[PDB]
Amino acid sequence: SNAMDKKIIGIDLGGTTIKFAILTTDGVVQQKWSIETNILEDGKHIVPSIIESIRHRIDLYNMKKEDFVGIGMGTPGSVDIEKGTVVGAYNLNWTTVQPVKEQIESALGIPFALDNDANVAALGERWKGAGENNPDVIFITLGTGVGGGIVAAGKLLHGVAGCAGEVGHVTVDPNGFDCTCGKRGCLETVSSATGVVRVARHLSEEFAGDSELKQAIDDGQDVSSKDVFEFAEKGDHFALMVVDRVCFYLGLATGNLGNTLNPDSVVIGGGVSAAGEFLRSRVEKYFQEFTFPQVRNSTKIKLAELGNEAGVIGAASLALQFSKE
Amino acid sequence: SNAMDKKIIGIDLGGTTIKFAILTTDGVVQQKWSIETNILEDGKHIVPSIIESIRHRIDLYNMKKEDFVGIGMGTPGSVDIEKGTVVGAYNLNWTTVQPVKEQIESALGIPFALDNDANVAALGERWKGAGENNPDVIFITLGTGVGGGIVAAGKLLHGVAGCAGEVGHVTVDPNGFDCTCGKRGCLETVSSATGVVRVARHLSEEFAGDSELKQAIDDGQDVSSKDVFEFAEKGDHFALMVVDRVCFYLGLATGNLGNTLNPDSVVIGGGVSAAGEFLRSRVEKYFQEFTFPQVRNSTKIKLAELGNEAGVIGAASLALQFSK
Numbered sequence: 150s151n152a153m154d155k156k157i158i159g160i161d162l163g164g165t166t167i168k169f170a171i172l173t174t175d176g177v178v179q180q181k182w183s184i185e186t187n188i189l190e191d192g193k194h195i196v197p198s199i200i201e202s203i204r205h206r207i208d209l210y211n212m213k214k215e216d217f218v219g220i221g222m223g224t225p226g227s228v229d230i231e232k233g234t235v236v237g238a239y240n241l242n243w244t245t246v247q248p249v250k251e252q253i254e255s256a257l258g259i260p261f262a263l264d265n266d267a268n269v270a271a272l273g274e275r276w277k278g279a280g281e282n283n284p285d286v287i288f289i290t291l292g293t294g295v296g297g298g299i300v301a302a303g304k305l306l307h308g309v310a311g312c313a314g315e316v317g318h319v320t321v322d323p324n325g326f327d328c329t330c331g332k333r334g335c336l337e338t339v340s341s342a343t344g345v346v347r348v349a350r351h352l353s354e355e356f357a358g359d360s361e362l363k364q365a366i367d368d369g370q371d372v373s374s375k376d377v378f379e380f381a382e383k384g385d386h387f388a389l390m391v392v393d394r395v396c397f398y399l400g401l402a403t404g405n406l407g408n409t410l411n412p413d414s415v416v417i418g419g420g421v422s423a424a425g426e427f428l429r430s431r432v433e434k435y436f437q438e439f440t441f442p443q444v445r446n447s448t449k450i451k452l453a454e455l456g457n458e459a460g461v462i463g464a465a466s467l468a469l470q471f472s473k474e
Numbered sequence: 475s476n477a478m479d480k481k482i483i484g485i486d487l488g489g490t491t492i493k494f495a496i497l498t499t500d501g502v503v504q505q506k507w508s509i510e511t512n513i514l515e516d517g518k519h520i521v522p523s524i525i526e527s528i529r530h531r532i533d534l535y536n537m538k539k540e541d542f543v544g545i546g547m548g549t550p551g552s553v554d555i556e557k558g559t560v561v562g563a564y565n566l567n568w569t570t571v572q573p574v575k576e577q578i579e580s581a582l583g584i585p586f587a588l589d590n591d592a593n594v595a596a597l598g599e600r601w602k603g604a605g606e607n608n609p610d611v612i613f614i615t616l617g618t619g620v621g622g623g624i625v626a627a628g629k630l631l632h633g634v635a636g637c638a639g640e641v642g643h644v645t646v647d648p649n650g651f652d653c654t655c656g657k658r659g660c661l662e663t664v665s666s667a668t669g670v671v672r673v674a675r676h677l678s679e680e681f682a683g684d685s686e687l688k689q690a691i692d693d694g695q696d697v698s699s700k701d702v703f704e705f706a707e708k709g710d711h712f713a714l715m716v717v718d719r720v721c722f723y724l725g726l727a728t729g730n731l732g733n734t735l736n737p738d739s740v741v742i743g744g745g746v747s748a749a750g751e752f753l754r755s756r757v758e759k760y761f762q763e764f765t766f767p768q769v770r771n772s773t774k775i776k777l778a779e780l781g782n783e784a785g786v787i788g789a790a791s792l793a794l795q796f797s798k
């Protein structure tokens with residue numbers, strides 16, 4: 150049927166790779182593709198590369214432009230939704246406000262929406278993943294950095310400056326490690342790929358025994374969070390001390406999100422989450438310590454179900470605001 | 475009978491008086507009245523008195539049910555919004571489930587909604603007080619307990635079990651005092667009228683130098699929070715220490731709300747907020763320490779501006795759900 154010919158495009162713009170998908174309006178992925186993110190020359194090539202990659206795909210496959218209901222994009226930094234504008238994407242070399250919506254919509258002639266990259270991932274997990282289309286879902290992504298998205302009373306939250314959802318920068322330890330954001334004791338300092346290592350680098354001195362994990366940490370290895378958790382599951386007394394510390398802080402931060410927002414679920418995604426049930430459990434355990442009874446007995450600690458496709462899926466969902474009603 | 479000019483009713487049910495207002499749908503006050511709260515007989519007279527007072531008023535003003543979009547009520551107790559019931563408002567003697575929404579609609583034929591005190595105070599300040607009607611406003615109320623409400627993307631938040639906005643039970647110290655709720659180090663534990671005093675009586679013992687605050691505690695006087703704030707305002711060195719502490723915790727909690735929700739404002743109200751700028755400015759200092767720049771330099775700390783009128787105006791706004 151003619152409804153089944155409609156398509157939406159999602160863009161997942163990351164510091165290293167830009168991923169695209171074409172999906173049905175029900176959010177089933179029809180095609181995926183990617184390119185490198187060119188950050189050279191103050192990142193002026195990024196938006197043209199995205200425009201070019203979409204023009205070429207449409208042309209390559211002789212696609213019908215009017216099948217497309219619209220394009221949704223997730224981007225690093227903070228987004229003014231009304232403006233279609235991106236500020237704070239320093240990792241991209243955008244030091245100045247970027248009129249991304251204007252450029253793409255203009256170039257492509259198909260309606261465009263954009264949002265922050267974890268925000269859009271949050272929408273993806275709500276729509277097709279662990280969020281289960283609940284009106285109240287918090288997404289937290291642990292990878293290179295710590296990011297998040299909040300859907301509350303059915304809507305994605307942005308706040309006054311587009312910074313709602315920034316849970317990586319919740320202070321879990323007023324006396325903790327220096328964060329790049331410019332304060333100390335952010336969740337991100339203790340829970341990103343790099344934060345877990347840092348927590349392990351500093352607990353090492355509190356462990357008089359030896360273990361395969363302690364040896365590699367002490368040697369200067371940047372062991373993945375996955376490997377750290379795997380040593381823990383496998384019984385490594387040092388890995389178990391590090392995981393314990395890490396999930397304490399994730400439990401405090403997610404707990405206080407539960408206490409304030411009471412979402413149906415907090416969904417944990419990103420690379421670390423491959424660690425699976427062993428991580429979900431330890432997070433849930435400290436979440437339980439830190440939450441009041443009504444929140445304990447209602448808000449659930451979940452793992453992401455979509456892996457790295459949540460971005461393109463969530464981004465795509467922003468395009469649905471353009472459907473003919 | 476002008477359908478282009480319907481009105482909303484707000485009700486603020488307190489333990490001693492019940493406040494009413496009629497507003498236009500834009501929230502301009504047309505009429506305010508109050509009656510006392512009769513709690514005798516397990517609180518069984520309260521909703522009939524409200525109905526009577528509203529019926530009578532409707533009759534005075536030659537109004538009819540069709541001139542009203544709805545009625546909203548703020549109440550203490552444990553509320554189920556969907557059902558429209560209340561339970562556990564012990565200052566009301568409401569120890570059994572009160573079918574408030576049934577009583578109201580079945581007597582008045584005007585649609586009714588209800589919510590908790592704090593939430594409705596939040597709606598008020600967001601709409602007509604310090605929130606300036608911005609879509610993202612967090613209100614927190616300091617007093618005998620710590621309570622709150624959050625408006626985000628223009629909607630009050632309730633969460634899946636109706637607990638959203640419960641700021642007083644955010645963990646500010648993983649190893650702090652025992653909270654009534656069952657866990658340690660809840661904000662309520664340090665920043666309620668009772669919490670402030672708790673902090674004073676727990677630091678005095680280490681402090682040695684001279685302060686009128688410390689001598690009074692050590693005389694055996696029943697020190698209050700307005701008293702602690704009093705003494706610090708006069709320069710009492712130990713009392714400033716206790717305020718610093720309370721504000722550190724308040725900074726952290728509001729700071730983290732700032733980091734997760736980035737509202738245009740965090741509005742601080744209730745009894746402890748009587749200290750005014752003396753309070754606000756210390757809270758803002760720790761809020762700044764605990765936020766990252768983009769939030770630090772957008773979300774504002776503000777004092778509540780409506781005082782005791784926030785409740786009735788925010789309760790009126792519940793009625794707007796029934797428009798058209």
Ligand SMILES: [Mg+2]
Binds near residue numbers: 265267268297313
């Ligand atoms: Mg986000």
Ligand SMILES: [Mg+2]
Binds near residue numbers: 590639
């Ligand atoms: Mg509330």
Ligand SMILES: [Zn+2]
Binds near residue numbers: 317329331766
């Ligand atoms: Zn930070």
Ligand SMILES: [Zn+2]
Binds near residue numbers: 441643653655657
């Ligand atoms: Zn508590």
